[PDB]
Design a protein around this ligand. Sequence first.
Ligand SMILES: [Mn+2]
Ligand SMILES: [Mn+2]
Length: 425
Amino acid sequence: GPHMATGQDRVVALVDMDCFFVQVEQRQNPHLRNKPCAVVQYKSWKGGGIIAVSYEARAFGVTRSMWADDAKKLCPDLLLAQVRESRGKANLTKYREASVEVMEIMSRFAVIERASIDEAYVDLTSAVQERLQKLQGQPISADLLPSTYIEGLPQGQKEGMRKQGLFQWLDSLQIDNLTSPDLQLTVGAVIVEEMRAAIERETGFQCSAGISHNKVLAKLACGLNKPNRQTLVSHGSVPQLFSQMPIRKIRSLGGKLGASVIEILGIEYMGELTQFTESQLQSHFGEKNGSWLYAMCRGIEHDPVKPRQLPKTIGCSKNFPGKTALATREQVQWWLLQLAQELEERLTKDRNDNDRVATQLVVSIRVQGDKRLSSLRRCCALTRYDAHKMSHDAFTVIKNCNTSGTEWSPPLTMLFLCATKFSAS
DNA sequence: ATTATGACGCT
Ligand SMILES: [Mn+2]
Ligand SMILES: [Mn+2]
């Protein structure tokens, strides 16, 4: 009872830009705004691979990782923006720079953890305490929450439902207790409305967000009401929400581990996990995963919001699938040079912007017919930002994979260069 | 012949 900690100490938000690459292209080209549109990479093979889809296009069934020619069968009016191509590969620079715009606005409100190019976690605990003291007892007006959904409410037209749920929540709120978790989540949501307003004002970009007590719940909440909306998942809403929540929807359970939870335990939903002791879970899934599952199914997770706005590694990758696989020495060299040239550009810009130097080069390759996604990964020293030297070293480091007797065999279906091990400069 | 990345765990 009194000693079971309930993981309500923090207020954590997950902000995710709605169809981010598409919005970047729609800001740049107004003809695309408020239309079915998608962003593609390459164009020759089946019109190119789609990597981002507006919500209007999604209503027709267009999805990521779908060929553009097939998407056009579902949505003949679909509009397409193409990723920039440089040195024969996709260049994502425009989206990394748009991402930094967004991150820099978010960083004004609270400390953020860049979780991907288009999403960050926010630790709002201090911000909420400060704002609570600023209110000095004033109750929270629904006007301050114009796009917030309260998950699980109403209980007992879409916007009509939203407002009813919010009204029930706010009427139930105990504004005089500055230590109530539910009040703290609520103030966190007010701040997140303000953050999302500043992002849209200063970039034109819309986003969704989740507000809860930890990263996993914030992330799960963010996806409940998209696009352009935010969802508050309270501690108290977890039993009902998790009672029908497929295990695969929880972050890190979408793959093999989640499938083995399902197969070994004979269950489907997150909430069923409550029935197992911690020791049982550790026995099946190992001590770390067991403790984590035992707490997570009760809505409790302790992973911190790391103060990290910048990526930890800077990487350059290209697949050479099918008959385009690289089969000669000249080919492997020239593409290592193209990759190393993009890497040099991004690294020099990174050193100037962020006062740091990478010190290790990671070279990863895939050979044709190899089952694995990395057929090999080897590291060497990264001592100067020179594309010719980095390409020469990556070669030097992979070349004993060639089994020919100027040819290259097995042909290579992927090259990958990654600068890592950053040190302040 | 989804592709381009990027974080993190295991050993
Ligand atoms: Mn997104
Ligand atoms: Mn995202």
